[PDB]
Design a protein around this ligand. Structure first.
Ligand SMILES: *[C@@H]1O[C@H](CO)[C@@H](O[C@@H]2O[C@H](CO)[C@@H](O[C@H]3O[C@H](CO)[C@@H](O)[C@H](O)[C@@H]3O)[C@H](O)[C@H]2NC(C)=O)[C@H](O)[C@H]1NC(C)=O
Ligand SMILES: *[C@@H]1O[C@H](CO)[C@@H](O[C@@H]2O[C@H](CO)[C@@H](O)[C@H](O)[C@H]2NC(C)=O)[C@H](O)[C@H]1NC(C)=O
Ligand SMILES: *[C@@H]1O[C@H](CO)[C@@H](O[C@@H]2O[C@H](CO)[C@@H](O)[C@H](O)[C@H]2NC(C)=O)[C@H](O)[C@H]1NC(C)=O
Ligand SMILES: *[C@@H]1O[C@H](CO)[C@@H](O[C@@H]2O[C@H](CO)[C@@H](O)[C@H](O)[C@H]2NC(C)=O)[C@H](O)[C@H]1NC(C)=O
Ligand SMILES: *[C@@H]1O[C@H](CO)[C@@H](O)[C@H](O)[C@H]1NC(C)=O
Ligand SMILES: *[C@@H]1O[C@H](CO)[C@@H](O)[C@H](O)[C@H]1NC(C)=O
Ligand SMILES: *[C@@H]1O[C@H](CO)[C@@H](O)[C@H](O)[C@H]1NC(C)=O
Ligand SMILES: *[C@@H]1O[C@H](CO)[C@@H](O)[C@H](O)[C@H]1NC(C)=O
Ligand SMILES: *[C@@H]1O[C@H](CO)[C@@H](O)[C@H](O)[C@H]1NC(C)=O
Ligand SMILES: *[C@@H]1O[C@H](CO)[C@@H](O)[C@H](O)[C@H]1NC(C)=O
Ligand SMILES: *[C@@H]1O[C@H](CO)[C@@H](O)[C@H](O)[C@H]1NC(C)=O
Ligand SMILES: [Zn+2]
Lengths: 9, 859
């Protein structure tokens, strides 16, 4: 895992 | 016969024991044939075996019994609703007797990327190659082979796949029997899998190259595509050191001979922790020691540590059901950041963790928030559970649980937890039970964790030091528009006598409490290094007490401490519990800060206010604001160099301060960037750019029709994907509205930009004034085609909406957004992300109502 950008949400 | 089972969950009756899976996949026709031998046992009495299967055409379904190798036919029963099949077994099987069940079937390899999926691509030498793989978490395993697709059904697996010559067959268990056949159709066979869950089975087929070295008896190896086999030298070197760490820390060995991290050559891959067969997105494994940055390195380390630690938490010890999903992922995320703090102490990954926790509390404090332990009865409720709250809140507790109990006490509770439940199914309470085995005595229970697991959000600790006694009060962190109470592991720090570094720990567990201070103290900071998952709101005199302390010597506390204070006060000033002038009054010390972690978070909070103001119409107010913040950091910003020199932590601050002073235009920060860009642009991009200034430099240059048009050239051409992604950001930072729309419209149908990049574009376009209104317009005016290209409830369709609306702060906009979603369906209007978005804008208005008037009388 669930990585893309953000981390956060 | 109609379906004999009417519930979602499979009946406790039949239970698998041993799986045999034989497959013949046709990668060039996207189809395959397979056979499954299911060694089932009985526990109760029933006339039917009920298990999972979806999208299949089934040849024969045969039955059998013990010690009589004859097999009689038994018809089938599909329902496809819950994805269940049923064997109408002829002889009422009975408790204790094992039965073997064989099913042969035909089906499609998937066109999407979920389940047993295949895809094609091109070579270094432009030759169109092929590939296939699996992603089974959480409910996809049933789409491949008919089986007992629930996590609490562990068993053994014999996999065999009949591949072609140049291809490489891989699966969880190692190869042992490869037996070429008479058409050049080699067949491999893999060992009997250890006891593991259905969702954890993996097997892939594609042309690959290995790179291995066995340590302590275990073969670690980074398999991947031919060309990129040179860039995997950081992957392997790290996987060893980390496998070496986890085996030593857990006091359990990795129960396999081999460990395979395969870098799937596709951008839409699924990263997963399959036993022995770890999967990654190709981009996220390649680390070049020469051309790649810190963000490239940190990610590659962090993502491996997460996948590894998952072999213990999630593979060995697996949860009984998806309601306890956070048990794996919360633990994997904790061991992630924890392993690095022990072995990769250079990365300063605690900074990443802190900011991550920051952004988690901001989202957990909302109303849309759901408790990590949450009833899961549907299947979209399962997909849901794979969210930020599970990974990071879950992580936060284990940290809070860690730093409360001894570090050693935390490990023992783990080692024993890991020991007792190996190769079995877990519950939330069962972690807690083996967490109270000692000290040595059950000196404490973990009913304390039952408030943190069962109810959403986090406490707001309020503090009032009135001499030698410290009054504590807790309450739910709420955002204006009972229940609760927490078992809070309180910690505090102060200076007493001869700057006496006094710290202590407590446990407020009632609406009110009090802590007995040894001496009299001038300042007291509660919650050290934000180890506790809560926010502390001091009283007026004690806030101002800490602020005075920060202006004198702000190093009596850690960087985490200082960062935490900046976070908490701005977020309190948001809800109105504190005047915003005091938040800024606190950061005033920042002129004397050399630690990034406070600075980054302080630059975050102020940039948010700037952007919120800006999108209204208060350009003057917004611009006067960033200059106030600039003057604090003036020295540091000047003092920076445009190089790649320093510790990871320090190269981060460089990237931070530079990207800042250039965005709003402050000091020489531009021009320098503009100079560099001109040099880089001149040399056809043959000049190395310092990856710490790469993004800044790219962005500045992109403000010219020439430099912009150049950067577009170097996107449709060059291959460096981390560089490609820094270039795209620059492209969408252009103020020429036309160029921005051209980007979004293009990226949609994927003309010069892949559609996966579209979310990143719409977001980036919408953060800055010229694109702001234009981004949201693009979303509405193309909403239908947006819903086609992205599952109406995937991370992308949320990220877009939130990314393109979170800056609206007027009643008028609130109505516009709401009304647009209304005029779609209510089944879209009641969707978690869209209702949440409305809450953000509502809260944005509230922030303005509380602080805008206050802000104006500064200057
Ligand atoms: C291996 O893990 C077992 C959990 O699966 C663990 O067992 C558990 O033992 C505790 C007490 O030691 C039981 O708890 C009880 O006490 C509370 C409060 O009095 C009651 O409300 C409960 O109902 C219960 O009586 C757990 O119920 C029990 N769990 C299970 C599933 O049996 C073993 O002790 C562990 N073994 C080793 C060697 O570590
Ligand atoms: C999938 O089925 C096709 C058709 O039966 C197989 O086809 C061949 O591919 C090889 C390349 O490895 C060629 O040399 C042959 O000429 C192809 N045959 C035909 C009839 O076109 C293919 O091998 C099968 N794949 C697997 C993994 O079994
Ligand atoms: C996936 O496999 C199925 C077979 O299970 C293929 O099915 C045809 O699908 C249509 C529905 O669109 C059915 O009405 C037919 O009965 C199916 N034919 C057979 C022989 O089963 C389906 O075409 C495959 N997927 C793709 C994309 O071709
Ligand atoms: C762990 O703590 C326990 C607490 O009781 C220690 O205890 C035992 O204490 C009882 C009385 O409370 C005695 O009757 C037993 O004989 C003690 N057992 C032993 C083995 O000494 C225990 O010693 C502590 N263990 C460690 C390793 O510190
Ligand atoms: C299942 O696949 C076989 C393979 O040839 C085919 O002949 C048969 O018609 C299929 N059955 C159904 C119901 O589609
Ligand atoms: C098969 O069943 C017998 C008793 O019916 C049992 O003893 C045996 O262990 C079972 N097989 C396996 C592999 O456990
Ligand atoms: C990995 O490469 C080494 C290089 O010598 C080779 O000996 C080994 O057989 C390879 N392993 C596999 C599974 O191909
Ligand atoms: C604090 O000290 C007071 C005595 O002034 C005592 O009555 C009280 O029990 C103490 N409480 C704690 C939590 O230490
Ligand atoms: C930061 O400042 C403190 C004193 O406030 C000093 O002890 C420390 O060495 C400094 N670190 C760096 C990297 O400048
Ligand atoms: C701009 O600031 C940098 C930072 O020290 C300095 O080295 C440079 O000389 C300045 N440029 C001009 C033209 O003053
Ligand atoms: C510039 O670099 C690109 C890289 O692909 C190349 O195609 C192009 O021919 C180069 N042009 C010059 C003038 O060097
Ligand atoms: Zn994970």
């Amino acid at each position: 895992x669930k990585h893309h950008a953000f981390s956060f949400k | 016969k109609l379906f004999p089972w009417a519930q979602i969950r499979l009946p406790t009756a039949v239970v698998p024991l041993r799986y045999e899976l034989s497959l013949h996949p046709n990668l060039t026709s996207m189809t395959f044939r397979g056979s499954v031998t299911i060694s089932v046992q009985a526990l109760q009495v029933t006339w039917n075996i009920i298990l999972h299967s979806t999208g299949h055409n089934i040849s024969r379904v045969t039955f059998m019994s013990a010690v009589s190798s004859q097999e009689k036919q038994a018809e089938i029963l599909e329902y496809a609703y819950h994805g269940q099949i049923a064997i109408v077994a002829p002889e009422a099987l009975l408790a204790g007797h094992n039965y073997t069940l064989k099913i042969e079937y035909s089906a499609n390899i998937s066109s999407s990327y979920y389940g047993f999926y295949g895809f094609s691509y091109t070579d270094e030498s432009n030759e169109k190659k092929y590939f296939a793989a699996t992603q089974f978490e959480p409910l996809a395993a049933r789409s491949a082979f008919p089986c007992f697709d629930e996590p609490a059904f562990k068993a053994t697996f014999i996999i065999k796949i009949i591949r072609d010559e140049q291809y490489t067959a891989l699966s969880n268990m190692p190869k042992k029997s490869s037996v070429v056949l008479d058409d050049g159709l080699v067949q491999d066979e893999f060992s009997e899998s250890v006891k593991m869950s259905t969702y954890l089975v993996a097997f892939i087929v594609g042309e690959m190259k290995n790179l291995s070295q066995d340590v302590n008896g275990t073969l670690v190896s980074i398999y991947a595509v031919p060309e990129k086999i040179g860039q995997v030298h950081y992957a392997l070197e790290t996987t060893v050191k980390l496998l070496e760490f986890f085996q030593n820390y857990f006091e359990i060995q990795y129960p396999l001979k081999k460990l395979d991290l395969v870098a799937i050559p596709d951008f839409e891959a699924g990263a997963m922790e399959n036993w022995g067969l770890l999967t990654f997105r190709e981009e996220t494994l390649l680390y070049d020691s020469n051309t790649s940055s810190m963000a490239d390195r940190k990610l590659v380390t962090k993502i491996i540590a997460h996948e590894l630690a998952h072999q213990w938490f999630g593979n060995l010890v697996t949860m009984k059901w998806w309601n306890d999903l956070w048990l794996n992922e919360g633990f994997a995320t904790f061991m992630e950041y924890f392993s690095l703090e022990k072995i990769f102490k250079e990365l300063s990954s605690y900074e990443d963790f802190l900011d991550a926790r920051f952004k988690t509390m901001k989202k957990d404090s909302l109303n849309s928030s759901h408790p990590i332990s949450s009833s899961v009865q549907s299947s979209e409720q399962i997909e849901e559970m794979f969210d930020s709250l599970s990974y990071f809140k879950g992580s936060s507790l284990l940290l809070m649980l860690k730093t409360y109990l001894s570090e050693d006490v935390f490990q023992h509770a783990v080692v024993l937890y890991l020991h007792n439940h190996s190769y079995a199914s877990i519950q939330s309470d069962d972690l807690w039970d083996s967490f109270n085995e000692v000290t040595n005595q059950t000196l404490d229970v973990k009913r304390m964790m039952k408030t943190w697991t069962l109810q959403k959000g986090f406490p707001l600790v309020t503090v009032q030091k009135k001499g030698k006694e410290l009054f504590i009060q807790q309450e739910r962190f709420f955002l204006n528009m009972t229940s609760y109470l927490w078992h809070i592991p309180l910690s505090y720090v102060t200076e007493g006598r001869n700057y006496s570094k006094y710290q202590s720990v407590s446990l407020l567990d009632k609406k009110s409490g009090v802590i007995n201070l040894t001496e009299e103290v001038l300042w007291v900071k509660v919650n050290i290094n934000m180890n506790g998952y809560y926010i502390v709101h001091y009283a007026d005199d004690d806030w101002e007490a800490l602020i005075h302390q920060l202006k004198i010597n702000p190093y009596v506390l850690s960087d985490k401490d200082r960062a935490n204070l900046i976070n908490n006060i701005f977020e309190l000033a948001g809800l109105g519990k504190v005047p915003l002038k005091r938040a800024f009054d606190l950061i005033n010390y920042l002129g004397n800060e050399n630690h990034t972690a406070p600075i980054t978070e302080a630059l975050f909070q102020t940039d948010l206010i700037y952007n919120l103001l800006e999108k209204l119409g208060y350009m003057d107010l917004a611009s006067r604001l960033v200059t106030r913040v600039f003057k604090l950091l003036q020295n540091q910003i000047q003092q920076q160099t445009w190089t790649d020199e320093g510790t990871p932590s320090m190269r981060e601050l460089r990237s931070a301060l530079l990207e800042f002073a250039c965005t709003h235009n402050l000091g020489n920060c531009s021009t320098t960037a503009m100079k560099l860009f001109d040099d880089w642009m001149a040399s056809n991009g043959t000049q190395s750019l310092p990856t710490d200034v790469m993004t800044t430099v790219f962005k500045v240059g992109a403000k010219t029709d020439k430099g912009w048009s150049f950067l577009l050239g170097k996107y449709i051409s060059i291959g460096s994907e981390a560089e490609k992604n820094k270039i795209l950001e620059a492209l969408a930072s252009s103020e020429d509205v036309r160029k921005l729309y051209w980007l979004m419209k293009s990226s949609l149908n994927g003309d010069n930009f892949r559609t996966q990049k579209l979310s990143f574009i719409i977001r980036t376009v919408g953060r800055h004034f010229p694109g702001h209104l234009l981004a949201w317009d693009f979303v509405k005016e193309n909403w239908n085609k947006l819903v086609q290209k992205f599952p109406l409830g995937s991370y992308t369709i949320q990220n877009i909406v939130a990314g393109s609306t979170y800056l609206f702060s007027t009643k008028t906009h609130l109505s516009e957004v709401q009304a647009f979603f209304e005029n779609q369906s209510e089944a879209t209007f009641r969707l978690r992300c869209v209702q949440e978005a409305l809450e953000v804008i509502q809260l944005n208005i509230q922030w303005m109502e509380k602080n805008l008037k206050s802000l104006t009388w500064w200057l």
